[PDB]
Amino acid sequence: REHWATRLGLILAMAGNAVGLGNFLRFPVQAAENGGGAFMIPYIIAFLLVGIPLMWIEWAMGRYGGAQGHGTTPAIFYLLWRNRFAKILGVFGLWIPLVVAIYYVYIESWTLGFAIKFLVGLVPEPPPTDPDSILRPFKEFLYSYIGVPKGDEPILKPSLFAYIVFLITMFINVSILIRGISKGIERFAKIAMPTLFILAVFLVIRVFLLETPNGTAADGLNFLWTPDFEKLKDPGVWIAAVGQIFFTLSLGFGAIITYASYVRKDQDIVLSGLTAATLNEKAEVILGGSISIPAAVAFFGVANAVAIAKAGAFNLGFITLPAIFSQTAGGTFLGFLWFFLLFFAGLTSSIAIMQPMIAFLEDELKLSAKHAVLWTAAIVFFSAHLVMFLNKSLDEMDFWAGTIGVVFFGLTELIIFFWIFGADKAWEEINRGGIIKVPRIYYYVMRYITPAFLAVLLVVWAREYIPKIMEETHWTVWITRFYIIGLFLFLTFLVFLAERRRNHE
Ligand SMILES: CCCCCCCCO[C@@H]1O[C@H](CO)[C@@H](O)[C@H](O)[C@H]1O
Ligand SMILES: CCCCCCCCO[C@@H]1O[C@H](CO)[C@@H](O)[C@H](O)[C@H]1O
Ligand SMILES: CCCCCCCCO[C@@H]1O[C@H](CO)[C@@H](O)[C@H](O)[C@H]1O
Ligand SMILES: CCCCCCCCO[C@@H]1O[C@H](CO)[C@@H](O)[C@H](O)[C@H]1O
Ligand SMILES: CCCCCCCCO[C@@H]1O[C@H](CO)[C@@H](O)[C@H](O)[C@H]1O
Ligand code: NA
Ligand code: NA
């Protein structure tokens, strides 16, 4: 089996797994529309009671499976619990990352396309003022790029440039993945993560210098870091905070598990996993939190910045921030640096999100790495046309896989590993080879607190929020639901074929 060459490479690959579009696009929007500091108390609590313990669990399951030649949850779940239902539940550890890849890589390709256009100066001219005179040309810029519908049809018409840039983006992902773990993902992470840190630090510094009649960057830091215990009893904030923790740490994606399956059997995962987790949180709250929100608050004030964050998921990062930069000297180049930052953040995460299907094809169907990567890329590339051309298909997949799926799968993998497999054997397996030991209090968190916390959360989710999405949606969401259900059936069939290969073997 392939293995990570160096410990630093391991940590930077896992940190690039986690540090992605979630840190720089998702976190600012979720924090802003949930009260800023009101969001941070649940967020910190979720990191300590959900994020960290699940990170260790996924590292442990991955390393455990990899020692036996399996890096994905169909096989690993069965190793933990020899029951055919374990294999079926394990399909989610391929389905979730595949579905997320199908829209994540497309969004990643937007950042490359914008980076190219901002570098070359093919960007809107804001007229020398009225805020909508500033925002409108950049709103139109994004809408023409992805082809937002202008009539009543729920159809997207992305520009030719956007489509070609998606092909290029897929080619870049393949170019890394096809070289494998140590020579591909690991080598690239050692280049991309330092670049990523430097770009973000420079952007934070430039943003902190922003000052207008409406405020300063410091006003945004105060909005984000001022506790607000009013919302502390609002269910929606807790669901938001825990969803962000899952998404940003790549938990419930099967992707931490697959990366860890290339960790040598006796190599530490306690300190490694903790470091990857803490690195992501620093990049999230310090770097991600210090760019978009402080810039928007400085130029528009808090109330308008909040309204902007509530406008959409891409309004802050693809419209508002480039519009703000356009009002500064060298602002188009600053836009390029922002979108190049997002591209590298996305690329290091999308190679991680596609490696689970690659590992399954290699491990269970015994494909060569080349064939496993190309077939995975073909599946993602083909399926992405749904996200490219059907309005709000992106949203539906991000919901079932990227939002509900990861939380459900996180609870599932914990129950399998810490209840069925055995809490004491799971605890033994986590700490084996540890450079440090997991704090003892965390045994009771993982066995009792984390599962109760996630179960309560999933209950209120399905009772007080899901019915709206099941009855209050446009009919075209059934196209996307139909297709991703088909994907689950196709993957279940591949698990079936992998079973019968190992029986005829
Ligand atoms: C083989 C993939 C199955 C679906 C066929 C997709 C064909 C893509 O079609 C292309 O989309 C671009 C972006 O809007 C347009 O610029 C081009 O006019 C169009 O040819
Ligand atoms: C970004 C690296 C090169 C790939 C992008 C080049 C493909 C852009 O293609 C261009 O799109 C526009 C469509 O009207 C027009 O400029 C031209 O028809 C076409 O050459
Ligand atoms: C299945 C994925 C969406 C396919 C729509 C992309 C093409 C949109 O553009 C279409 O290109 C077609 C040929 O490529 C032509 O038949 C259409 O007349 C033309 O409008
Ligand atoms: C995977 C594709 C999801 C659905 C996207 C359909 C894009 C439709 O695209 C266009 O629609 C026109 C009607 O307005 C038709 O004349 C053309 O067939 C087609 O080019
Ligand atoms: C959700 C629980 C948050 C965990 C906070 C970190 C706990 C570290 O706390 C330490 O735990 C060690 C147990 O091994 C003990 O040796 C120490 O007495 C204690 O200080
Ligand atoms: Na992240
Ligand atoms: Na990343």
Author numbering: 5 to 132, 135 to 511
Please quote the authors directly.
LeuT, the bacterial homolog of hDAT, has provided key insights that have improved our understanding of Na+/substrate-coupled transport in the neurotransmitter sodium symporter (NSS) family. In the NSS superfamily, which includes DAT and LeuT, thermodynamic coupling of substrate and Na+ -co-transport occurs via an alternating access mechanism that comprises the opening and closing of the IC and EC gates. R445 is aligned to R375 in LeuT, which forms the R375-E6 salt-bridge as part of the IC gate.
First, we determined the effects of substitutions at the LeuT residue corresponding to R445 of hDAT, R375 in LeuT: LeuT R375A, LeuT R375D, and LeuT R375C. In all structures (superimposed), L-Ala, Na1, and Na2 (purple spheres) could be modeled into their respective binding sites (left). These crystal structures showed that R375A and R375D substitutions in LeuT precluded salt bridge formation between R375 and E6, and between R375 and the backbone of I184 as was also observed with Rosetta modeling in Figure 4A. In addition, K189 moved towards E6 by 3.4 Å, reducing the distance between residues K189 and E6 from 8.0 Å in LeuT WT to 4.6 Å in LeuT R375A (middle bottom), in agreement with Rosetta modeling. The distance between residues R5 and D369, and between residues E6 and I187, was conserved in all three structures (right bottom), as also found with Rosetta modeling. We found that both neutralizing and acidic substitutions at R375 likely promote the dissociation of the E6-R375 salt bridge (closest atom-atom distances: WT = 2.1 Å; R375A = 5.4 Å; R375D = 4.2 Å), weaken the interaction of R375 and I184 (closest atom-atom distances: WT = 2.5 Å; R375A = 6.0 Å; R375D = 4.7 Å), and decrease the thermodynamic stability of LeuT (Rosetta scores: R375A = +4.4 REU; R375D = +5.6 REU relative to WT). The substitution R375A increased the probability of an IF conformation only in the Apo (black trace) and Na+/Leu states (blue trace) (right). We have previously shown that other mutations associated with neuropsychiatric disorders (i.e. ΔV269) that disrupt this IC network also bias LeuT to an IF conformer, impairing transporter function. It is important to note that in the Apo conformation R375A does not alter LeuT IC gate to the extent of R375D.
